[PDB]
Design a binder for this molecule. Structure first.
Ligand code: CL
Ligand code: MN
Ligand code: MN
Lengths: 7, 293
């Protein structure tokens, strides 16, 4: 979820 | 370049409260980048490695976890190491992480190996944290120096003709290992093609053949692509990283592919361990695991 480039 | 002084300062913080920085000089880090880049260019882009060795997946600037991995597995050169990429971004200490890895590459260039991950790419690390860390703690010129070094990292490795290692995974354009060997360096990571896929693709349990990748680039691939690849090239295992896995490691396609992820506690969603894979002299694989906090 950190941003799906990737949690 | 006083490598032992650099390594000594990087290791000094073992046992400190996780978070303590090691601030090398700008000239020292430039030297690490320039010398390691020379070494990367002097060695093949497709490495041919021998077991035994330890294989590590993504680190993402989790420097104290890197130190734990070395504590568990043996500090170089007590064990040979292959890292699969994604050294920087996301974590708090990308600088210490990459500096220690580059220092060990220079000190032990035939016993310590670093592959390129998709985060070893200016387009990605501009946004995902490494540029900001360089700008805050050093300057942007040093970030470019890092980029120039990353552009020379090797892309894949084959251990004892049996384990194919890369950061991401397979490519629909990968028909011969010679295609990898023909890739010229320095290079950026393209947004499509063989080099892109090797750093970006993912295995998927629900894909037959090649599918669209949720990342917006490259592809997903299924279990039969893996089996066909291993059969064609007389390989036993694909070892890759790139995806967070709860156990630190995860097998795929009836244990024909393994994903390693070495940064524990990476995400807010689920807890994840970090794992390092020990490959013994006969290519038998076991794991050393940083369990989640
Ligand atoms: Cl498939
Ligand atoms: Mn990755
Ligand atoms: Mn990663």
């Amino acid at each position: 979820x950190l941003x799906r480039x990737x949690x | 370049l006083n490598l032992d002084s650099i390594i000594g300062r990087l290791l000094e913080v073992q046992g400190s409260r996780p978070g303590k920085n090691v601030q090398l000089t700008e000239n020292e880090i430039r030297g690490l980048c320039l010398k390691s880049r020379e070494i990367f260019l002097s060695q093949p882009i497709l490495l041919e490695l021998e077991a035994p060795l330890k294989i590590c997946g993504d680190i993402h600037g989790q420097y104290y976890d890197l130190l734990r991995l070395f504590e568990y597995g043996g500090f170089p050169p007590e064990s040979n190491y292959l890292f699969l990429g994604d050294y920087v971004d996301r974590g708090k200490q990308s600088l210490e992480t990459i500096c220690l890895l580059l220092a060990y590459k220079i000190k032990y260039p035939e016993n310590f190996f670093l592959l390129r991950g998709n985060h070893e790419c200016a387009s990605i690390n501009r946004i995902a944290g490494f540029y900001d860390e360089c700008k805050r703690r050093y300057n942007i010129k040093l970030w470019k120096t890092f980029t120039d070094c990353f552009n020379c990292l090797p892309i894949a490795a084959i251990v004892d003709e049996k384990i194919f290692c890369c950061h991401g995974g397979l490519s629909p354009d990968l028909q011969s290992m010679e295609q990898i060997r023909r890739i010229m360096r320095p290079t950026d990571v393209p947004d499509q093609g063989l080099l892109c896929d090797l750093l970006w693709s993912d295995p998927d349990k629900d894909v037959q053949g090649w599918g669209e990748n949720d990342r917006g680039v490259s592809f997903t691939f299924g279990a039969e692509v893996v089996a066909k690849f291993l059969h064609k090239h007389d390989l036993d295992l694909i070892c890759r990283a790139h995806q967070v896995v709860e156990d630190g490691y995860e097998f795929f396609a009836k244990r024909q592919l393994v994903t390693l992820f070495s940064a524990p506690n990476y995400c807010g969603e689920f807890d994840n361990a970090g794992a390092m894979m020990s490959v013994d002299e006969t290519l038998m694989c076991s794991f050393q695991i940083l369990k989640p906090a």
